[PDB]
Each structure stands twice: as C-alpha cells, then as structure tokens.
C-alpha cells in the first residue's frame, strides 16, 4: 500500500536526476546534479554509486534501482544541520527567499516570487518570510 503522495515524491526525486525524462539515470545526469550543487565527483566515483544499486548490470539506474538507492542512502541532527548550511548560504541563519530560490535553481527548478513564498509558508512559524533553524527542524520532522 504505497500512497500516490509517496509515489509522486519518488517520481519528483527520480526526475531531478533524469533530466532527459528517458527513465534511466546515467553518470552524466548524476554528475550534472552533483556539480550544480557544488560537488565534483569523478566519473569513476559516479559509476561506483550506480554499481551499488545496478541490479541488472546495464550500467545505469532505472526506477526500482533508484528506489533501492533511496532506501539505502536515506545522525538525524548532523544531517539536518548540514542541509540547513546549504540553504542558509550567508550563515545568518535565516533562510531568505533569495537563498531558497538559489538552492531551488540548482535543483533545476525555475521559480517565481509567489511559489517561493508558498514554499516558505510550509516552514515559517512567525511569518517573517524566512526560515530559521528551529522552523527548519520542525518542517523536517512534521507529517
């Protein structure tokens, strides 16, 4: 009994990587995402990530193999704080609308001001238009 909300979240995650919508994630695609996020994995390191979950040996990740990676790859505290540090680029720590838009762009999402504000309304518990660390922790632990 998977829900369609769960399935949609899996789809959305798969699509981040599968830039060409062909249903297969390649080292090229995995690398594209990682570089836009500031990382610099080598081709060989990317291939080793794939090999780990590549059940049919074809060298690329398909949907159920991806679900396998997520099961395996997804320190509660240290993991939430490291993510916060990516969002709160200037370290003040409030995540501004401009900081959120920068992360979202790197996630291949081109957003306007209005849904940036919608995004912020998921976590913002004092209505200052920003997400601070406590609000960030709440958002990650809620329903």
């Amino acid at each position: 009994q998977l829900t369609e909300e769960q399935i949609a979240e899996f789809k959305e995650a798969f699509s981040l990587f599968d830039k060409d919508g062909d249903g297969t994630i390649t080292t090229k695609e995995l690398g594209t995402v990682m570089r836009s996020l500031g990382q610099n994995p080598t081709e060989a390191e990317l291939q080793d990530m794939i090999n780990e979950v590549d059940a049919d040996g074809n060298g690329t990740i398909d949907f159920p193999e991806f679900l396998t990676m997520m099961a395996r790859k997804m320190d509660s505290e240290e993991e939430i704080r490291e993510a916060f540090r990516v969002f709160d680029k200037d370290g003040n720590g409030y995540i501004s609308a401009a900081e959120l838009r920068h992360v979202m762009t790197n996630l291949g999402e081109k957003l306007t001001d209005e849904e940036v504000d919608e995004m912020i309304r998921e976590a913002d518990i004092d209505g200052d238009g920003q997400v601070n660390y406590e609000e960030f922790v709440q958002m990650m632990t809620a329903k």
Binding site: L30, M74, E79, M140
Partner: peptide, 16 residues
C-alpha cells in the same frame, strides 16, 4: 516542496 527539497540536498550530500 520545501521538505522534499531538503531531502534531495541531503541525498546528494550522502552520495558524496
């Protein structure tokens, strides 16, 4: 989308 986006950042972080 916000919570889901954080998870996607964390995923790539774990991959590296």
């Amino acid at each position: 989308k916000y919570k889901q986006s954080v998870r996607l950042i964390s995923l790539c972080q774990r991959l590296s």
